[PDB]
């Protein structure tokens, strides 16, 4: 099996800039049968490059493929607003076809610290037997941020799930939502419920907290 390793994982660039994406094969790709695909959220992939360098009719000339053997490269001469998406590389020199893990090309902007909010479980949900505390990280960049749950100042680990929105079309930031889920019984055994966030735009880690019933 041929293993394709794309680089980098994420590409932070601005509209008007040049974008170069790398694809490294574990072993030599036969007959240079390397292809490049573009995919946007909720859409099927779109063929950009095939045969490592050939470009299908209908693809902008800013997309150019290059390289051979084990090293391949997709080049975007000048990034356009709709060129910010996910890019997969695929080998089909062997019968057994393999993909890369993909490279996301995002819009790079000035680092922005998130506005942190915390939400106690509603009285309605407490009657059902469960407790959900929601930590909100609003409009931040870059995507790399860490959320740590602290119940009575004790690191909670394995009862929380987080999700991130796609990069905004306006301010090019991200928003994260982490939801800590306890049973009503466990929830009433403690008092201080706090969410700790560490981010580049924050000098010191910010902690938002509330006291149960207060």
């Amino acid at each position: 099996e041929i293993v394709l390793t794309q680089s980098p994982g994420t590409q932070s660039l601005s509209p008007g800039e040049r974008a170069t994406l790398s694809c490294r094969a574990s072993q030599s790709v036969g007959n240079n049968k390397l292809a490049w695909y573009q995919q946007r959220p909720g859409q099927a992939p779109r063929l950009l490059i095939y045969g490592a360098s050939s470009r299908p009719s209908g693809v902008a000339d800013r997309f150019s493929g290059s390289g051979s053997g084990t090293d391949f490269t997709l080049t975007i001469s000048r990034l356009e607003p709709e060129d910010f998406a996910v890019y997969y590389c695929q080998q089909y020199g062997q019968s057994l076809s393999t993909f890369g893990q993909g490279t996301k090309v995002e819009v790079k902007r000035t680092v922005a610290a998130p506005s942190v909010f915390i939400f106690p479980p509603s009285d309605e949900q407490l009657k059902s037997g469960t407790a959900s505390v929601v930590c909100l990280l609003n409009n931040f960049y870059p995507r790399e941020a860490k959320v740590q749950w602290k119940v009575d100042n004790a690191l909670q680990s394995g009862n929380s799930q987080e999700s991130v929105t796609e990069q905004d079309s306006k301010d090019s930031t991200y928003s994260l939502s982490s939801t800590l889920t306890l049973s009503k019984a466990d929830y009433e055994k403690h008092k201080v419920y706090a969410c700790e966030v560490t981010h580049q735009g924050l000098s010191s880690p910010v902690t938002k907290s509330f006291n149960r019933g207060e």
Binding site: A35, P45, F99, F119, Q161, E162, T165
Partner: protein
Amino acid sequence: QVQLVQSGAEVKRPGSSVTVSCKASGGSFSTYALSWVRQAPGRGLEWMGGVIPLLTITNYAPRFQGRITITADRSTSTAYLELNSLRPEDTAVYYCAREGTTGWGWLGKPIGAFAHWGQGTLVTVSSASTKGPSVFPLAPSSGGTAALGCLVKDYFPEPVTVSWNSGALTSGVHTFPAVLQSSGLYSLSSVVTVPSSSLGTQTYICNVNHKPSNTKVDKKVEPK
């Protein structure tokens, strides 16, 4: 041009078998390789297998070789993907792809790479039944920028649509992607940041819709 039309989305219980269809319309169906490429939510693309209809030459990926079966019907120009012994980790969007041709017709050699994709087929493998969501209020705290929202908890299956004030409120709204809880039910959050001064004057109701269970909830969110 050529276009590939796949069958609708479906939900299957673990252990069962699913069959996805793919109807082609355009070029020659017999001499171009038809492949299947799946993609788990948030994850990357994964090649499953392909078939050249003329010689019925199939080629499966070793990871699926044993429970997967790809056939091509030259009578209806329809390829079929059959996946047996389904398990929750097979939950993905299944795409039918066909190799491109060199430019146009007649004098058009095959290029191997996938130039033509279907719209995709969502296959959800879960042991859960259709359940309407419970909508709980994420009430704003007791500058400058205050956050509120509604928690859409414990529903199945996808999707759930959320609007604010019947669509009259869009600025500053964030509806996060749903997460798969251990219960096998989905859960998302829909938040919105507004001026703090408007908390005591502006009514904030969220409209949550869940078509599969035919559920519509208008939950009002106000300060505690």
